[PDB]
Scaffold this active site. Structure first.
Site, PDB file in Angstrom:
ATOM      1  N   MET C  74     138.470  11.411 161.458  1.00 40.34           N
ATOM      2  CA  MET C  74     138.832  11.324 162.878  1.00 40.34           C
ATOM      3  C   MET C  74     138.779   9.883 163.418  1.00 40.34           C
ATOM      4  SD  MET C  74     140.209  14.295 163.969  1.00 40.34           S
ATOM      5  CE  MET C  74     140.317  15.918 163.276  1.00 40.34           C
ATOM      6  N   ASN C 100     134.379  19.731 167.601  1.00 40.76           N
ATOM      7  CA  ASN C 100     132.987  19.726 167.157  1.00 40.76           C
ATOM      8  C   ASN C 100     132.524  18.524 166.344  1.00 40.76           C
ATOM      9  OD1 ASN C 100     131.052  20.863 164.669  1.00 40.76           O
ATOM     10  ND2 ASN C 100     130.364  21.585 166.661  1.00 40.76           N
ATOM     11  N   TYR C 164     125.450   7.617 170.805  1.00 44.58           N
ATOM     12  CA  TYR C 164     125.778   9.040 170.783  1.00 44.58           C
ATOM     13  C   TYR C 164     125.743   9.599 172.206  1.00 44.58           C
ATOM     14  CZ  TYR C 164     124.787  14.100 169.903  1.00 44.58           C
ATOM     15  OH  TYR C 164     124.760  15.475 169.911  1.00 44.58           O
ATOM     16  N   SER C 165     124.749   9.184 173.042  1.00 44.39           N
ATOM     17  CA  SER C 165     124.654   9.673 174.428  1.00 44.39           C
ATOM     18  C   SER C 165     125.850   9.235 175.231  1.00 44.39           C
ATOM     19  CB  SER C 165     123.375   9.201 175.103  1.00 44.39           C
ATOM     20  OG  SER C 165     122.263   9.963 174.666  1.00 44.39           O
ATOM     21  N   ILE C 199     119.402  22.020 167.284  1.00 41.40           N
ATOM     22  CA  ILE C 199     119.811  23.113 166.402  1.00 41.40           C
ATOM     23  C   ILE C 199     119.430  22.780 164.957  1.00 41.40           C
ATOM     24  CG2 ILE C 199     121.621  24.835 165.881  1.00 41.40           C
ATOM     25  CD1 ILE C 199     121.218  24.381 169.067  1.00 41.40           C
ATOM     26  N   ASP C 200     118.848  23.765 164.248  1.00 39.69           N
ATOM     27  CA  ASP C 200     118.342  23.722 162.866  1.00 39.69           C
ATOM     28  C   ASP C 200     119.337  23.360 161.747  1.00 39.69           C
ATOM     29  OD1 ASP C 200     118.007  27.294 161.898  1.00 39.69           O
ATOM     30  OD2 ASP C 200     119.708  26.165 162.733  1.00 39.69           O
ATOM     31  N   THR C 201     120.368  22.560 162.055  1.00 38.25           N
ATOM     32  CA  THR C 201     121.344  22.125 161.049  1.00 38.25           C
ATOM     33  C   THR C 201     120.710  21.059 160.151  1.00 38.25           C
ATOM     34  OG1 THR C 201     122.583  20.371 162.271  1.00 38.25           O
ATOM     35  CG2 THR C 201     123.187  22.675 162.732  1.00 38.25           C
ATOM     36  N   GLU C 202     121.103  21.037 158.874  1.00 40.41           N
ATOM     37  CA  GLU C 202     120.632  20.094 157.848  1.00 40.41           C
ATOM     38  C   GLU C 202     120.593  18.620 158.314  1.00 40.41           C
ATOM     39  OE1 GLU C 202     118.830  20.831 155.157  1.00 40.41           O
ATOM     40  OE2 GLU C 202     120.109  20.694 153.363  1.00 40.41           O
TER      41      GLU C 202
HETATM   42  N1  LIG Z   1     122.483  19.966 165.449  1.00 45.41           N
HETATM   43  C1  LIG Z   1     122.064  19.705 166.727  1.00 45.41           C
HETATM   44  O1  LIG Z   1     120.894  19.751 167.055  1.00 45.41           O
HETATM   45  C2  LIG Z   1     123.032  19.372 167.785  1.00 45.41           C
HETATM   46  C3  LIG Z   1     124.372  19.296 167.581  1.00 45.41           C
HETATM   47  N2  LIG Z   1     125.273  19.009 168.637  1.00 45.41           N
HETATM   48  C4  LIG Z   1     126.726  18.927 168.408  1.00 45.41           C
HETATM   49  O2  LIG Z   1     127.268  19.917 167.537  1.00 45.41           O
HETATM   50  C5  LIG Z   1     128.370  19.274 166.878  1.00 45.41           C
HETATM   51  C6  LIG Z   1     128.223  19.483 165.393  1.00 45.41           C
HETATM   52  O3  LIG Z   1     126.898  19.134 165.040  1.00 45.41           O
HETATM   53  P1  LIG Z   1     126.217  19.603 163.645  1.00 45.41           P
HETATM   54  O4  LIG Z   1     127.038  20.830 163.198  1.00 45.41           O
HETATM   55  O5  LIG Z   1     124.727  19.654 164.029  1.00 45.41           O
HETATM   56  O6  LIG Z   1     126.495  18.374 162.664  1.00 45.41           O
HETATM   57  P2  LIG Z   1     126.833  18.217 161.062  1.00 45.41           P
HETATM   58  O7  LIG Z   1     126.688  16.722 160.744  1.00 45.41           O
HETATM   59  O8  LIG Z   1     126.096  19.189 160.140  1.00 45.41           O
HETATM   60  O9  LIG Z   1     128.451  18.393 161.023  1.00 45.41           O
HETATM   61  C7  LIG Z   1     129.266  17.310 161.456  1.00 45.41           C
HETATM   62  C8  LIG Z   1     130.657  17.608 160.929  1.00 45.41           C
HETATM   63  O10 LIG Z   1     131.561  16.557 161.290  1.00 45.41           O
HETATM   64  C9  LIG Z   1     132.269  16.155 160.113  1.00 45.41           C
HETATM   65  N3  LIG Z   1     132.584  14.743 160.198  1.00 45.41           N
HETATM   66  C10 LIG Z   1     131.666  13.705 160.107  1.00 45.41           C
HETATM   67  N4  LIG Z   1     132.218  12.517 160.198  1.00 45.41           N
HETATM   68  C11 LIG Z   1     133.549  12.764 160.320  1.00 45.41           C
HETATM   69  C12 LIG Z   1     134.651  11.903 160.437  1.00 45.41           C
HETATM   70  N5  LIG Z   1     134.468  10.529 160.442  1.00 45.41           N
HETATM   71  N6  LIG Z   1     135.928  12.436 160.552  1.00 45.41           N
HETATM   72  C13 LIG Z   1     136.074  13.782 160.539  1.00 45.41           C
HETATM   73  N7  LIG Z   1     135.066  14.722 160.433  1.00 45.41           N
HETATM   74  C14 LIG Z   1     133.826  14.145 160.331  1.00 45.41           C
HETATM   75  C15 LIG Z   1     131.290  16.440 158.956  1.00 45.41           C
HETATM   76  O11 LIG Z   1     131.903  16.598 157.671  1.00 45.41           O
HETATM   77  P3  LIG Z   1     132.492  15.390 156.741  1.00 45.41           P
HETATM   78  O12 LIG Z   1     131.263  14.509 156.501  1.00 45.41           O
HETATM   79  O13 LIG Z   1     133.043  16.174 155.560  1.00 45.41           O
HETATM   80  O14 LIG Z   1     133.648  14.694 157.364  1.00 45.41           O
HETATM   81  C16 LIG Z   1     130.727  17.772 159.419  1.00 45.41           C
HETATM   82  O15 LIG Z   1     131.660  18.820 159.124  1.00 45.41           O
HETATM   83  C17 LIG Z   1     128.449  17.832 167.369  1.00 45.41           C
HETATM   84  O16 LIG Z   1     129.387  17.681 168.419  1.00 45.41           O
HETATM   85  C18 LIG Z   1     127.035  17.597 167.804  1.00 45.41           C
HETATM   86  O17 LIG Z   1     126.920  16.648 168.853  1.00 45.41           O
HETATM   87  C19 LIG Z   1     124.800  18.798 169.933  1.00 45.41           C
HETATM   88  C20 LIG Z   1     123.528  18.868 170.216  1.00 45.41           C
HETATM   89  C21 LIG Z   1     122.496  19.117 169.158  1.00 45.41           C
HETATM   90  O1  LIG Z   2     122.040  16.064 170.054  1.00 47.40           O
HETATM   91  C1  LIG Z   2     120.946  15.542 169.795  1.00 47.40           C
HETATM   92  N1  LIG Z   2     120.812  14.920 168.601  1.00 47.40           N
HETATM   93  C2  LIG Z   2     121.315  13.511 168.430  1.00 47.40           C
HETATM   94  C3  LIG Z   2     122.086  13.285 167.113  1.00 47.40           C
HETATM   95  C4  LIG Z   2     121.530  14.061 165.898  1.00 47.40           C
HETATM   96  C5  LIG Z   2     122.567  15.051 165.333  1.00 47.40           C
HETATM   97  C6  LIG Z   2     123.312  15.903 166.043  1.00 47.40           C
HETATM   98  N2  LIG Z   2     124.062  16.582 165.176  1.00 47.40           N
HETATM   99  C7  LIG Z   2     123.770  16.144 163.950  1.00 47.40           C
HETATM  100  N3  LIG Z   2     122.838  15.191 164.039  1.00 47.40           N
HETATM  101  C8  LIG Z   2     120.183  14.783 166.172  1.00 47.40           C
HETATM  102  C9  LIG Z   2     120.166  15.645 167.458  1.00 47.40           C
HETATM  103  N4  LIG Z   2     119.943  15.628 170.720  1.00 47.40           N
HETATM  104  C10 LIG Z   2     120.138  16.546 171.899  1.00 47.40           C
HETATM  105  C11 LIG Z   2     119.192  17.760 171.814  1.00 47.40           C
HETATM  106  C12 LIG Z   2     117.745  17.410 171.401  1.00 47.40           C
HETATM  107  C13 LIG Z   2     117.545  15.959 170.897  1.00 47.40           C
HETATM  108  C14 LIG Z   2     116.227  15.486 170.789  1.00 47.40           C
HETATM  109  C15 LIG Z   2     115.970  14.185 170.349  1.00 47.40           C
HETATM  110  C16 LIG Z   2     117.027  13.339 170.023  1.00 47.40           C
HETATM  111  C17 LIG Z   2     118.338  13.796 170.144  1.00 47.40           C
HETATM  112  C18 LIG Z   2     118.610  15.107 170.563  1.00 47.40           C
END
Ligand SMILES: NC(=O)C1=CN([C@@H]2O[C@H](COP(=O)(O)OP(=O)(O)OC[C@H]3O[C@@H](n4cnc5c(N)ncnc54)[C@H](OP(=O)(O)O)[C@@H]3O)[C@@H](O)[C@H]2O)C=CC1
Ligand SMILES: O=C(N1CCC(c2cnc[nH]2)CC1)N1CCCc2ccccc21
Ligand SMILES: NC(=O)C1=CN([C@@H]2O[C@H](COP(=O)(O)OP(=O)(O)OC[C@H]3O[C@@H](n4cnc5c(N)ncnc54)[C@H](OP(=O)(O)O)[C@@H]3O)[C@@H](O)[C@H]2O)C=CC1
Ligand SMILES: NC(=O)C1=CN([C@@H]2O[C@H](COP(=O)(O)OP(=O)(O)OC[C@H]3O[C@@H](n4cnc5c(N)ncnc54)[C@H](OP(=O)(O)O)[C@@H]3O)[C@@H](O)[C@H]2O)C=CC1
Ligand SMILES: NC(=O)C1=CN([C@@H]2O[C@H](COP(=O)(O)OP(=O)(O)OC[C@H]3O[C@@H](n4cnc5c(N)ncnc54)[C@H](OP(=O)(O)O)[C@@H]3O)[C@@H](O)[C@H]2O)C=CC1
Ligand SMILES: O=C(N1CCC(c2cnc[nH]2)CC1)N1CCCc2ccccc21
Ligand SMILES: O=C(N1CCC(c2cnc[nH]2)CC1)N1CCCc2ccccc21
Ligand SMILES: O=C(N1CCC(c2cnc[nH]2)CC1)N1CCCc2ccccc21
Lengths: 266, 270, 258, 262
Positions: C74, C100, C164-165, C199-202
Site C-alpha cells: 500500500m 484495515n 501511528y496516532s 487486541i490479542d493479535t500476534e
Molecule cells: N491489534 C490491536 O491491538 C489494534 C489494532 N488496530 C487496527 O487494526 C488494524 C489491523 O491491526 P492488526 O490486525 O492488529 O495488525 P497485523 O499487523 O497483525 O496485520 C496488519 C496487516 O497489514 C498488512 N500490511 C502490512 N504492511 C503492509 C503494506 N506495506 N502494504 C500492504 N499491506 C500491509 C500485513 O500483512 P503483510 O505484512 O503481508 O503485508 C497484515 O495483513 C489496523 O488498522 C490497526 O490500527 C487498532 C487498535 C488496536
Molecule cells: O493501537 C494501538 N497500538 C499501536 C500500534 C501497535 C499495533 C497495532 N496493530 C498492530 N500493532 C500496538 C497497539 N494502541 C491503541 C489501543 C491500546 C494501546 C496501548 C498502548 C499503545 C498503543 C495502543
C-alpha cells in the site's frame, strides 16, 4: 430497565388505563388530550373540579374509552392513597401512572420560607412516592409504567427555584434508585424520568415573564414525547427547545459509576 | 462562588467558631477533633448527651479554644432553630456551620415505608435548611461558610438507599441553587457540598456486606478533607478510597449548562 | 448518515462483495474468515502472497461465495488504485470496502524518525483515500459501505505511538468530514469508523510486551464487531475489554459543534 | 506538562528568539507585529519575499530586538530543516517555534483530489514535524515552546474541508503524543495546540463568502492569544467569537482516558 426496542405507534395506548396528575391545565391537560385521541381510559386529577370537568368533557369528545376526574389536594396523603384506589376501581386496573402535579411556585430568592420548602417536598416529591405505593400492585399485574415528570432544575442548579430544584432532584434520587431495585427484585414496572425545559404553559409563562428570557417549547408536543417515552419504557426523556441541552444533559460518568459498580455488591 | 486560591493552613481555623452537627460519633466526631487540634471554638450536637460529653472532654484535651455540646433531635425544627441561636450566642458568632447529621438508615429495598421517606427528608434535608436559615445572619457577618455533608448516593443512583438518596439529592438541588443566588445577591457566604464514598465509620461498617468493607477510606482523613475544602471556600469536595471514582464524580456538562442558562435572566427585580 | 435500525443477522453479508485490506494476519484475516462463514464474496490483500493463499483456501473451506487475493504494498499508490478495479472485476462490483492495513509500527519514543511519520501517513492514511476514490463509483451503485479500522490512539493521545496516532487522527478528520458531505450530497455510501482498544493479535502482543500492562480483547470477537458496524451502517464502532473506555469515548460536545 | 502559574505579561517575550511560519499575511503577520511590540527577536517565513521584507521593516519600527525573513515553500522538506538552522544563527538560538502556515484551501466537496490531500498533509502537518525535529536541540537548550496553530476543523468534522481537517487532526494526534512522551522523558519543551474558530483573515473571508457564517473573530486579538497561550506553556488554547464555542471545545473524557492509560 430495558426499553421496548421498536417505534412508537399511537395504537400502543388504545384501551390502556392511565392516571394523569396535574391534568386540569398545562402539560397534564395536554397529556390527557393525547391519551383521549388514542382511545385510552383516563382518570385525571387536580384540586379544581370546574377546570377538571372541562378537561373530561373534551376527553370523551376526543374519544377516550372512558374519562373521569377526582378532585383533591396532593398535600393530603390520604387523598393520594385513596385517589389511586378510586381510579383503579373506575378503570378496572392500571397500566400507566403519570405523576405530573406540582405545588404553586414563583421565581424568588430564598430567604426564610421553610413552609414552602416543606410544601414543595410534600406535593412535588412525597405525594409521588405515596401514589407509587398505592399504584404498584396494579402496575405489577399489568407490567405497567410509572412516569415521573421532572425539570432541567432537577438535573442542574438554577437560582430563584431552590425549593422546586430540591423536590425535582429528590425525584431523580428516589425513582432512579427503585428502578435499580426493580431490576434486582425482577419487578416488571418501568420508570420514566422526564427532564423538561421551558414549556409554553400559562403558569410557566406568567412566572418567567420579565425575569427569564429563553424559547418555550410547545406543550402539545411536550406531552406527546412524555407519553412516547413512557410507552417505550425509556428510563429517561429529555425535552427542550435547545439542542445543546438534550446532548449535554445525559451523564455517562453517572452510568459508569452506577453500572461499573453495580456488579460489586451481593 | 469564587474560592480561596491559597493552600490550606491549620491556622485558618484557629479561634474560628464552628457548629458540628451529628458529632457524637463517625465523621462528625473526627471533624470536631480536627477543629480541636486547630484550636477552634466548637459547638457539637447529636441526641445523646453521654456520647457528646466524651467528644467535648476529648476536644478540650486536643487543644480546642472552647468545646460545648447541645443535645436534641433534628426531627424537631424548633430545637434546630434554637440550637443555632444558643450555639452562636455561646461563641459570640459563627464562622462555619458543618451540616453532617442523618437519621438512622440501613440498606434495604424500599417496602412502602413512607414514614422512612418522610423522616429522611425532615432530618437529612429540611433540618439542614432550618439550620442555614437560622445561621445566615451570623455567617453573613463573619463572611462565613456552610458545609453540607453528602454522599456518592447524592449524585448517582443506588439500590437499597432510595429514601436516603432522595434526601441527599435534595441537598444538591437546594444548596447548589442558593449558592447561585448568593453570587447574584453578593452574599459572601460559601457553600461546600461534600461527595463521600464509603468511609470506615462504625455505622457504615455495620451496614455494608463483604470485601467492600476493606475498600473504606479512613474517617479521620475524610473529616480533615471536609474541613480543608470548607475552609478553602470550594464548591464541591470529593473524597473516596479510589482515585478513579473521584474522576467519574465530576460533571463538566452540568457546569456548562449552568453557565449557559446564567445569561438567560435579568436579576434586577430582587 | 442513517444506520440500519435492526438486529445484525449473518445473512446481511450473504453474496455481498467485500474487499478486506491487511488480510494476511491478525484482525484482517479474522474478518476474511467471518465473511467466509457468512457466505460473502471476499477479495483479500496484503504483501505476503503465500500467507494470503492460505487465507483464500481457508475462506473457500468456511463457505465463501468466492475468494481471491491480490498481493502488493500500500506504499505503491498505483497498486492501491489498480487493486480496487481488479477486485471489482473479480466479483463484478463492490458492496463493502474494509480498510484495515497499517505499516509495521513499534512502541518507541519520537526522536528524528520522519521516515516513520511519512511511511505511517502514506500507508495508514493516504492509501485509504486512494482506495476510497477508486472504490467510490462501485460503492455508489451498490449503496455500499466504507469501513475504516482505527484505534483509541486515533481518538486520545498516547506516548510511544506519535506517527501511528497522527495517521489514525487524520483518518477521523478525513472520513468523518466526507461523511457529512455524503449526507448533504445524498450519497448513500456509509462510513464506519472503528475505534479499537488493545487486541490479542500476534503483532500488537509483541509490540506491547513488558512496555504496556493491559488486558487484550480477542481478535475473533473484534473482527465480528467491525463487520456488524459496517453491515448496520453505524457511524462509529467502539471495541475494547474496558467498559469505562466504551462509555467515556463518545463526544456530545463534538456532536453539538457538528 | 506544567503551564506557568503566572499572569501573562508582554515582558515575557522581551529578547526571546521566536520563529513565525506563515507570517507574510493573516494571523502569522499579526503575531510577528505583536512579538515586535514585545521587544522579541523574530525570524519570519512564507513564500512572499516582497511582503516578508515589508513585515520585517514594520517589525523593526514596532520595536523588535531583531527581525529577519527567509523566503521559501514548506512543500520543500529540505528548506524546512535548512530554515531552522539559519533562523537559529540569525538570533543565536530559539525560544519559541510558532508553526502557523498552511497550504491554500477552498471550501469544496471531495471527489478525487488526492493531490490536495497529499499536499495538505505535506504542508500543514509534515513540514511541522520536520521543523520540530530541527528546532528541538535549540528548544531543549532554552526549555522553549512549540506553538501549533490548529482549527475547530482539527477537533470536529465539517464538510467541504476534508483534506484540511485530516492534516489538522494529524497535528493533534502527533503533538499531543509527543507532549506525553516529553512529560515522561523529562523534556522541558512546552507544546501548545491552538484551536481557532473563524478569524477575519482575507484568505478565510474570501473562502467562506459564498456561505452563511458566524461572526469572524479579530486577527489581532487571536494572534496575541496564540502568544499568551504559548508564553504561558498551556497545552491548548481556544479562540473564537463565541464563549459557547470555546466551552464546547474542551474534551474532559479524553483527558480522563489519557490518565487512565498512563
Ligand atoms: N491489534 C490491536 O491491538 C489494534 C489494532 N488496530 C487496527 O487494526 C488494524 C489491523 O491491526 P492488526 O490486525 O492488529 O495488525 P497485523 O499487523 O497483525 O496485520 C496488519 C496487516 O497489514 C498488512 N500490511 C502490512 N504492511 C503492509 C503494506 N506495506 N502494504 C500492504 N499491506 C500491509 C500485513 O500483512 P503483510 O505484512 O503481508 O503485508 C497484515 O495483513 C489496523 O488498522 C490497526 O490500527 C487498532 C487498535 C488496536
Ligand atoms: O493501537 C494501538 N497500538 C499501536 C500500534 C501497535 C499495533 C497495532 N496493530 C498492530 N500493532 C500496538 C497497539 N494502541 C491503541 C489501543 C491500546 C494501546 C496501548 C498502548 C499503545 C498503543 C495502543
Ligand atoms: N411548564 C414548564 O415550563 C415546565 C414544567 N415542568 C414540569 O411539568 C409539570 C407540569 O407543569 P405545568 O404543566 O407547567 O404546570 P401547570 O401549573 O400548568 O399545572 C399544574 C397542575 O397541578 C395541579 N395542582 C397544583 N397544586 C396542586 C396540589 N396541591 N395538589 C394537586 N394538584 C395540584 C394544578 O391544578 P390545581 O391548581 O387545580 O390543583 C394543575 O392541574 C410539573 O411537574 C413541572 O415541574 C418541568 C420543566 C418546565
Ligand atoms: N459513613 C459513610 O460511608 C458515609 C457517610 N456520609 C455522610 O457523612 C455523615 C455522617 O455519617 P457517619 O459519620 O457515617 O454517621 P454516624 O452514624 O457515625 O453519625 C451520625 C450522627 O448523627 C446523629 N444523629 C442521628 N440521628 C439524629 C437526629 N435525629 N437528630 C440529630 N442528630 C442525629 C448521631 O447521634 P445520635 O444517634 O446521638 O443522635 C451521630 O452523631 C452523613 O451526612 C452521611 O450521609 C456520606 C457518604 C458515606
Ligand atoms: N482564518 C481562520 O478563520 C482560521 C485560521 N486557522 C489557522 O491559522 C493559520 C493561518 O491562518 P490564516 O492566517 O487565516 O491564513 P492566511 O492564508 O492569511 O496565511 C497562511 C500563511 O501561510 C503562508 N503560506 C502559504 N502557502 C505556503 C507554503 N506552500 N509554504 C509556506 N508558507 C505558505 C502564507 O504566505 P505566502 O502565501 O506568502 O507563502 C500565509 O502567511 C493556519 O494554521 C490555519 O489553519 C485555524 C482556524 C481558523
Ligand atoms: O421548570 C422550570 N420552572 C420552575 C417553576 C415554574 C413552572 C414550571 N412549570 C410551571 N411553572 C417556572 C419554570 N424551569 C426549567 C426550565 C426553564 C427554567 C428557567 C428558569 C427557571 C426555571 C426553569
Ligand atoms: O453514603 C452511603 N451510605 C448509605 C447509608 C449508610 C450510611 C451512611 N452513613 C452512615 N451509614 C451506608 C453508606 N453510600 C456511599 C458509599 C457506600 C454506599 C454503599 C451502598 C449504598 C450507598 C452508599
Ligand atoms: O479553518 C477553517 N476553514 C478551512 C480552511 C479555510 C482557511 C482558513 N484559514 C485560511 N483559509 C477557510 C475556513 N474553518 C475554521 C472556522 C470554522 C469553519 C467552518 C467550516 C469550514 C471550515 C472552518
Amino acid at each position: 430497565q430495558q426499553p421496548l426496542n421498536e417505534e412508537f405507534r399511537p395504537e400502543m395506548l388504545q384501551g390502556k388505563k392511565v392516571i394523569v396528575t396535574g391534568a386540569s391545565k398545562g402539560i397534564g391537560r395536554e397529556m390527557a388530550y393525547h391519551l383521549a385521541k388514542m382511545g385510552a381510559h383516563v382518570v385525571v386529577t387536580a384540586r379544581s373540579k370546574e377546570t377538571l370537568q372541562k378537561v373530561v368533557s373534551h376527553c370523551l369528545e376526543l374519544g377516550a374509552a372512558s374519562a373521569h376526574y377526582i378532585a383533591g389536594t396532593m398535600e393530603d396523603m390520604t387523598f393520594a392513597e385513596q385517589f389511586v384506589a378510586q381510579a383503579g376501581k373506575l378503570m378496572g386496573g392500571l397500566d400507566m401512572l403519570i405523576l405530573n402535579h406540582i405545588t404553586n411556585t414563583s421565581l424568588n430568592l430564598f430567604h426564610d420560607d421553610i413552609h414552602h420548602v416543606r410544601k414543595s417536598m410534600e406535593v412535588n416529591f412525597l405525594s409521588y412516592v405515596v401514589l407509587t405505593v398505592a399504584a404498584l400492585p396494579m402496575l405489577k399485574q399489568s407490567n405497567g409504567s410509572i412516569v415521573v415528570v421532572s425539570s432541567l432544575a432537577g438535573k442542574v442548579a438554577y437560582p430563584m427555584v431552590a425549593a422546586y430544584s430540591a423536590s425535582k432532584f429528590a425525584l431523580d434520587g428516589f425513582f432512579s434508585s427503585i428502578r435499580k431495585e426493580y431490576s434486582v427484585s425482577r419487578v416488571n414496572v418501568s420508570i420514566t424520568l422526564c427532564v423538561l425545559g421551558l414549556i409554553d404553559t400559562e403558569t410557566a409563562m406568567k412566572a418567567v415573564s420579565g425575569i427569564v428570557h429563553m424559547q418555550a417549547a410547545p406543550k402539545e408536543e411536550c406531552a406527546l414525547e412524555i407519553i412516547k417515552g413512557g410507552a417505550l419504557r425509556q428510563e429517561e426523556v429529555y425535552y427542550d427547545s435547545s439542542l445543546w441541552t438534550t446532548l449535554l444533559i445525559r451523564n455517562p460518568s453517572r452510568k459508569i459509576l452506577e453500572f461499573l459498580y453495580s456488579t460489586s455488591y451481593n
